[PDB]
UniProtKB/Swiss-Prot annotation, chain A:
DNA-dependent RNA polymerase catalyzes the transcription of DNA into RNA using the four ribonucleoside triphosphates as substrates. Transmembrane segments: none annotated. This is DNA-directed RNA polymerase subunit beta. Disulfide bonds: none annotated. Belongs to the RNA polymerase beta chain family. The chain holds residues 1088 to 1137 of 1383 of the full protein. The RNAP catalytic core consists of 2 alpha, 1 beta, 1 beta' and 1 omega subunit. When a sigma factor is associated with the core the holoenzyme is formed, which can initiate transcription.
Swiss-Prot record, chain B:
Residues 1-211 are annotated as: Alpha N-terminal domain (alpha-NTD). Keywords: DNA-directed RNA polymerase, Nucleotidyltransferase, Transcription, Transferase. The keyword Transferase applies. It is an enzyme of class 2 (transferase). The N-terminal domain is essential for RNAP assembly and basal transcription, whereas the C-terminal domain is involved in interaction with transcriptional regulators and with upstream promoter elements. This is DNA-directed RNA polymerase subunit alpha. Homodimer. The RNAP catalytic core consists of 2 alpha, 1 beta, 1 beta' and 1 omega subunit. When a sigma factor is associated with the core the holoenzyme is formed, which can initiate transcription. DNA-dependent RNA polymerase catalyzes the transcription of DNA into RNA using the four ribonucleoside triphosphates as substrates. The chain holds residues 11 to 231 of 332 of the full protein. The gene is rpoA.
Length: 50, 211
């Protein structure tokens, strides 16, 4: 007699364990999330993300 | 011993000079101050945004070119320096065609806003934009989950990048005393003097457990 459809929008962040592949076929799984202070930095101060 | 020497290359990015340190004291002090200047300094950011016409963060409002999420990211991009207090509330009123900058908001006497060359949104029609903001104090990174009302992430970090290098200073002493320079690039919120002052305060409060 009646139908109710509910649209639910979820915005998920990135989690350790999610599968993320590159462009040339090098797939991978995120191990952990590291703070910026532990990442290796260049001579100018730019921290490497990956 | 002589005090920190301040160079002024850019009004947003300064450089401090510490000299003369002993042999084997430049690298540890530089790395400790770099890590503390990166991930310890508290700041101010926008936590929640209350708009009367916008119900949730996925709807479309008439008269606006961009979506609501672009306005939320542009409000996350700006930086607010507050003199005193742990909470504040800023409102903006802008109608008619034209761009909406960060300087068009209504601020208090203690709440200081950067001039804001980055735009927030783009208005086309003659629609009034009544938007209420909220500023809170904190340190680090706090997500929206763990804390008609919207919620926004906040990155309480006025410092962008910290670099340092150890150079030798030719001085008549018992050994080869080395100096170091630290160039701090901020968003204009915090100064390079009180940043290393509260970094040394954090180090002195953390080293107070021994003894």
């Amino acid at each position: 007699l009646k139908m109710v459809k509910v649209f639910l929008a979820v915005k998920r962040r990135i989690q350790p364990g999610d599968k993320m592949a590159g462009r040339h076929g090098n797939k991978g799984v995120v191990s952990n999330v590291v703070p910026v202070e532990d990442m290796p930095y260049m001579a100018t101060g730019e921290s490497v993300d990956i | 011993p002589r005090g920190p020497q301040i160079e002024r290359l850019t009004d947003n990015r300064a450089k401090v000079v510490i000299e003369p340190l002993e042999r084997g004291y430049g690298h540890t002090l530089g790395n400790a101050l770099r890590r503390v200047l990166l991930s310890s300094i508290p700041g101010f950011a926008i936590t929640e945004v209350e708009i009367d016409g916008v119900l949730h963060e996925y709807t479309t409002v008439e008269g606006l070119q961009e979506d609501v999420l672009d306005v939320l990211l542009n409000l996350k991009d700006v930086a607010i320096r507050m003199h005193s207090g742990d909470s504040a509330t800023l409102s903006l009123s802008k109608q008619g065609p034209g761009t909406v900058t960060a300087a068009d908001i209504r601020t208090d006497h203690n709440v200081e806003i950067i001039n804001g060359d980055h735009v927030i949104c783009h208005l086309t029609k003659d629609t009034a934009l009544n938007m209420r903001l909220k500023i809170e104090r904190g340190f680090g990174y706090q997500p929206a989950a763990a804390r008609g009302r919207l919620m926004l992430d906040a990155s309480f970090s006025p410092v962008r990048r910290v670099a340092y290098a150890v150079e030798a200073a030719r001085v008549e002493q018992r050994t080869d005393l080395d100096k170091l320079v630290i160039d701090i690039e901020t968003n204009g919120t915090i100064d390079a003097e009180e940043a290393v002052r509260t970094a040394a305060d954090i180090l002195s409060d953390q080293l107070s457990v021994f003894g």
